Amino acid sequence: STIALSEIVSVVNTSDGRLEVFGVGTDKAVWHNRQMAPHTGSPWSGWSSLKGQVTSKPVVYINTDGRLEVFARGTDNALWHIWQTATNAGWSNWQSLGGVITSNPAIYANTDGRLEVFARGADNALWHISQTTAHSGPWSSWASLNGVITSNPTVHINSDGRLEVFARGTDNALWHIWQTAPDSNLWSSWESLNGIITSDPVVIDTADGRLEVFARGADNALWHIWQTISHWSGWQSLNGVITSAPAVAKNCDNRLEAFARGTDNALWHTWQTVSHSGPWSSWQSLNGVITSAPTAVRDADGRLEVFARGTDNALWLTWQTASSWSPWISLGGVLIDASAIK
Amino acid sequence: TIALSEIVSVVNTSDGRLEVFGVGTDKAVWHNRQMAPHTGSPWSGWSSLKGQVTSKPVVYINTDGRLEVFARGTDNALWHIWQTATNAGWSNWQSLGGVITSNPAIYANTDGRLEVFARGADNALWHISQTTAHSGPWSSWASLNGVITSNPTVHINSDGRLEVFARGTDNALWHIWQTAPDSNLWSSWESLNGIITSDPVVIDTADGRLEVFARGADNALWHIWQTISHSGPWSGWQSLNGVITSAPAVAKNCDNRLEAFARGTDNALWHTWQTVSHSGPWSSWQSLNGVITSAPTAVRDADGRLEVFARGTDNALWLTWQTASSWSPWISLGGVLIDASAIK
Numbered sequence A: 001s002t003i004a005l006s007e008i009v010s011v012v013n014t015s016d017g018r019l020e021v022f023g024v025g026t027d028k029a030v031w032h033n034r035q036m037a038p039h040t041g042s043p044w045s046g047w048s049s050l051k052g053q054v055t056s057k058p059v060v061y062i063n064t065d066g067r068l069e070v071f072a073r074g075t076d077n078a079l080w081h082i083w084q085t086a087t088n089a090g091w092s093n094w095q096s097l098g099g100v101i102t103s104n105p106a107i108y109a110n111t112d113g114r115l116e117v118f119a120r121g122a123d124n125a126l127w128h129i130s131q132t133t134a135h136s137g138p139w140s141s142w143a144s145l146n147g148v149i150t151s152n153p154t155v156h157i158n159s160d161g162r163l164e165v166f167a168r169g170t171d172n173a174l175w176h177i178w179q180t181a182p183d184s185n186l187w188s189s190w191e192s193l194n195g196i197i198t199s200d201p202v203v204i205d206t207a208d209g210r211l212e213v214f215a216r217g218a219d220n221a222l223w224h225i226w227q228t229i230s231h232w233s234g235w236q237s238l239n240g241v242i243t244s245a246p247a248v249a250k251n252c253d254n255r256l257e258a259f260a261r262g263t264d265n266a267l268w269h270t271w272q273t274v275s276h277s278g279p280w281s282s283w284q285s286l287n288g289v290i291t292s293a294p295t296a297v298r299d300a301d302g303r304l305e306v307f308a309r310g311t312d313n314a315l316w317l318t319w320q321t322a323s324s325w326s327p328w329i330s331l332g333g334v335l336i337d338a339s340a341i342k
Numbered sequence B: 001t002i003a004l005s006e007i008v009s010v011v012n013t014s015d016g017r018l019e020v021f022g023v024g025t026d027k028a029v030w031h032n033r034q035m036a037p038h039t040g041s042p043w044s045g046w047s048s049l050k051g052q053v054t055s056k057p058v059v060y061i062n063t064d065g066r067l068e069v070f071a072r073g074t075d076n077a078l079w080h081i082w083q084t085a086t087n088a089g090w091s092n093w094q095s096l097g098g099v100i101t102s103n104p105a106i107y108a109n110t111d112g113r114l115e116v117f118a119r120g121a122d123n124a125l126w127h128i129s130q131t132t133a134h135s136g137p138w139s140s141w142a143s144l145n146g147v148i149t150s151n152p153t154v155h156i157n158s159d160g161r162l163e164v165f166a167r168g169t170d171n172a173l174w175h176i177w178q179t180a181p182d183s184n185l186w187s188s189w190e191s192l193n194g195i196i197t198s199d200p201v202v203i204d205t206a207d208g209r210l211e212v213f214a215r216g217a218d219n220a221l222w223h224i225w226q227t228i229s230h231s232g233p234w235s236g237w238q239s240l241n242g243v244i245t246s247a248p249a250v251a252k253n254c255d256n257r258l259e260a261f262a263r264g265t266d267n268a269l270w271h272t273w274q275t276v277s278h279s280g281p282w283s284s285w286q287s288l289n290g291v292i293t294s295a296p297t298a299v300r301d302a303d304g305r306l307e308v309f310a311r312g313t314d315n316a317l318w319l320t321w322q323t324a325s326s327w328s329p330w331i332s333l334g335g336v337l338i339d340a341s342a343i344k
């Protein structure tokens, strides 16, 4: 009935290459903050409200026309959304997509540009709904993929265009289910990848087109598992002792880099050395005192930026410099953890 | 007349390997691909996809990861061949009909439907598209009018609208765009002025602005750009100097710094690059040596390094890439390639 502490924001690279973060304020509204300019260390806009009243982490996704769209569980437990009405410009009103959900929503674009949203239902199964045409309503009917899940779901597209969803099962193993063809409503059966996981799964598509899943294990280390050929391996440990969900992102050269809170409440990281096919470093501290999981993203200068909530409940930020990382700086605001599953 | 063309079409496959496509002495399409997703990977060697082509062959990756090659045939129709699956074999060559007079230019709409553009016998711009994402059947051909004198170049805007560029009859750079993503409604043709003496090369910058590169009347490398993400007004033309004897090729370093490549007056490969960051000033031109007989083709590999291909004095495809501090010694991938560009 427990997962590692969640991320405090959802992040996206905008149509024009800037970082934009979304989180939940003390009023339960979705707020957001963005870089002025597409560069590491740009000034930030400060927090502005998109209003609403939410009961999940708000999750941003960029439509294939560049319009941001934010999905969140509402006060009636329906899936709600709000979208830019023109690329990188004004926002709509909040609208309901109905349903009854009991997790944070997870989103990906099909190969046809239709966004598809996945979330745990009132029956604890995985449900989904999608745009009927590319980056546009109306939306489909809600449909079930069955199963019984106990984490937030995570979706990613394979290198052949098939969506695949990952979630913790009732035996605490990592389970997954996939599209049998791109854009399809036909899916495989649920299948177990075994292991024990104690966080939401984090899924990345490698430079060589293989899905790779990261999760906290029963021993509180960071573990991972991967497809052996483009579109599985044994579970393998990357060690560490982590007190939050992990975050993973790709460097300029596609080397993966994993971030998580330590038992000292500092941010810690481990990275692939040499290349995207290389072995992982041992862990190193990036300091700070943080009160959420980190959120990691590559910016328009090819530099990793990491966000995490601080002891004052503001969002703080550190990034890669030529040969080190920048001192933690505050972006202000007061953010709450509204994750539907804690 | 246009500056000497690129000799190959290159792509980063869905599993992170570079794959190049060219025309052999037999007029067939040949290809060569990295075994591994890394700078300096060994190569397959040249093998034939057959066909007899009469344009540059142009590869594009469908949104399901399957490569698809487009080329003009001996009957002047558009022809194509595609992978049946991402790491499987190829279809037979199949005709999309029409009669075309340029190399094809391809881009995916926001709905995953490929759209192909080519000049017609009337010298207008024509187009045809997949009816559903990454799949046949295709639409009927239709015209976007105009009178064009180079190969066309297409790129998607950061708001999803396709936009096509081509030299006009006054030798200026002209363009035309979708009014909405996935749409069959387009703007009128509009001039961006200047004089161009190569095909246009079009990039979408890290900040979502289309930027076009072309050789000028003075044989320098020139460029012009949208000043606002997916929007006019455009800049005026600006020179990046140099004196170039081929079409330019442009690619993004992993940090998004643009880098332009072209054959020099000494027939070596030369380049100029943005300094500091993706909105910084360009360097002076510097030589990467070699003696080349086509325009270069530049592409960022799965290690985030630039790799540049060009035909050599023996008509083989040669290759140099970025290393930590410099560039690798030119190396040969063999083969014998011809310039089959439908417009020269």
Ligand SMILES: C[C@@H]1O[C@@H](C[C@H]2C[C@@H](CO)O[C@@H](O)C2)[C@@H](O)[C@H](O)[C@@H]1O
Binding pocket: A024, A025, A026, A027, A031, A046, A047, A332, A333, A334, A335
């Ligand atoms: C995310 C938001 O954070 C603070 C406002 C921000 C508004 C902004 C105005 O410029 O200033 C920042 O420092 C504070 C709180 O008062 C809000 O209830 C909300 O939790």
Ligand SMILES: C[C@@H]1O[C@@H](C[C@H]2C[C@@H](CO)O[C@@H](O)C2)[C@@H](O)[C@H](O)[C@@H]1O
Binding pocket: A051, A052, A053, A054, A072, A073, A074, A075, A076, A080, A093, A094
């Ligand atoms: C995310 C949603 O948030 C509010 C929507 C209202 C937000 C308001 C902002 O002005 O607009 C009104 O039309 C809708 C709640 O009432 C809903 O139950 C839901 O939790």
Ligand SMILES: C[C@@H]1O[C@@H](C[C@H]2C[C@@H](CO)O[C@@H](O)C2)[C@@H](O)[C@H](O)[C@@H]1O
Binding pocket: A146, A147, A148, A149, A168, A169, A170, A171, A175, A189, A190
């Ligand atoms: C995600 C998994 O979900 C159920 C199995 C699924 C197996 C499947 C058989 O193919 O049928 C579905 O309805 C039930 C549970 O019993 C497992 O412990 C796990 O939580």
Ligand SMILES: C[C@@H]1O[C@@H](C[C@H]2C[C@@H](CO)O[C@@H](O)C2)[C@@H](O)[C@H](O)[C@@H]1O
Binding pocket: A194, A195, A196, A197, A216, A217, A218, A219, A220, A223, A234, A235, A236
């Ligand atoms: C993800 C990991 O899952 C189990 C080990 C796995 C090791 C693997 C062989 O390497 O076999 C699998 O069946 C079990 C747990 O004991 C670990 O603490 C961790 O939670």
Ligand SMILES: C[C@@H]1O[C@@H](C[C@H]2C[C@@H](CO)O[C@@H](O)C2)[C@@H](O)[C@H](O)[C@@H]1O
Binding pocket: A287, A288, A289, A290, A309, A310, A311, A312, A316, A327, A328, A329
């Ligand atoms: C994420 C932030 O972490 C610490 C400050 C950092 C300040 C920084 C100075 O640049 O030094 C680092 O070692 C510590 C806390 O005091 C803040 O409230 C916040 O929780």
Ligand SMILES: C[C@@H]1O[C@@H](C[C@H]2C[C@@H](CO)O[C@@H](O)C2)[C@@H](O)[C@H](O)[C@@H]1O
Binding pocket: B023, B024, B025, B026, B030, B045, B046, B047, B333, B334, B335, B336, B337
């Ligand atoms: C691109 C092709 O290039 C050569 C064959 C290549 C075959 C390869 C071994 O299969 O060896 C390489 O060195 C040469 C020519 O003879 C063909 O007509 C065609 O122009």
Ligand SMILES: C[C@@H]1O[C@@H](C[C@H]2C[C@@H](CO)O[C@@H](O)C2)[C@@H](O)[C@H](O)[C@@H]1O
Binding pocket: B050, B051, B052, B053, B072, B073, B074, B075, B079, B092, B093
């Ligand atoms: C690109 C095309 O290439 C050949 C046909 C292909 C037809 C196919 C039959 O399925 O076989 C392949 O080897 C050759 C020519 O005859 C066509 O006019 C066209 O130029």
Ligand SMILES: C[C@@H]1O[C@@H](C[C@H]2C[C@@H](CO)O[C@@H](O)C2)[C@@H](O)[C@H](O)[C@@H]1O
Binding pocket: B145, B146, B147, B148, B167, B168, B169, B170, B174, B188, B189
């Ligand atoms: C690409 C351009 O194409 C024609 C004009 C187009 C302008 C437009 C009139 O508004 O109508 C279209 O059919 C014709 C030529 O006259 C120009 O020199 C140029 O080559």
Ligand SMILES: C[C@@H]1O[C@@H](C[C@H]2C[C@@H](CO)O[C@@H](O)C2)[C@@H](O)[C@H](O)[C@@H]1O
Binding pocket: B193, B194, B195, B196, B215, B216, B217, B218, B219, B222, B236, B237
């Ligand atoms: C792209 C360039 O086009 C013309 C000049 C442009 C320079 C620009 C400077 O302000 O103004 C525009 O109207 C014309 C030619 O003379 C150049 O050799 C080159 O072909």
Ligand SMILES: C[C@@H]1O[C@@H](C[C@H]2C[C@@H](CO)O[C@@H](O)C2)[C@@H](O)[C@H](O)[C@@H]1O
Binding pocket: B241, B242, B243, B244, B245, B263, B264, B265, B266, B270, B284, B285
């Ligand atoms: C692409 C290169 O372009 C010119 C030089 C550039 C060299 C640079 C450094 O002097 O200055 C710029 O104005 C001109 C020619 O001399 C080279 O042979 C080559 O064709």
Ligand SMILES: C[C@@H]1O[C@@H](C[C@H]2C[C@@H](CO)O[C@@H](O)C2)[C@@H](O)[C@H](O)[C@@H]1O
Binding pocket: B289, B290, B291, B292, B311, B312, B313, B314, B318, B329, B330
């Ligand atoms: C692109 C290639 O260019 C030269 C070789 C390069 C070999 C290299 C030594 O590794 O030195 C450089 O200066 C020249 C020519 O001799 C080749 O036939 C070919 O056209």
Ligand SMILES: [Cl-]
Binding pocket: A251, A252, A253, A254
């Ligand atoms: Cl790097």
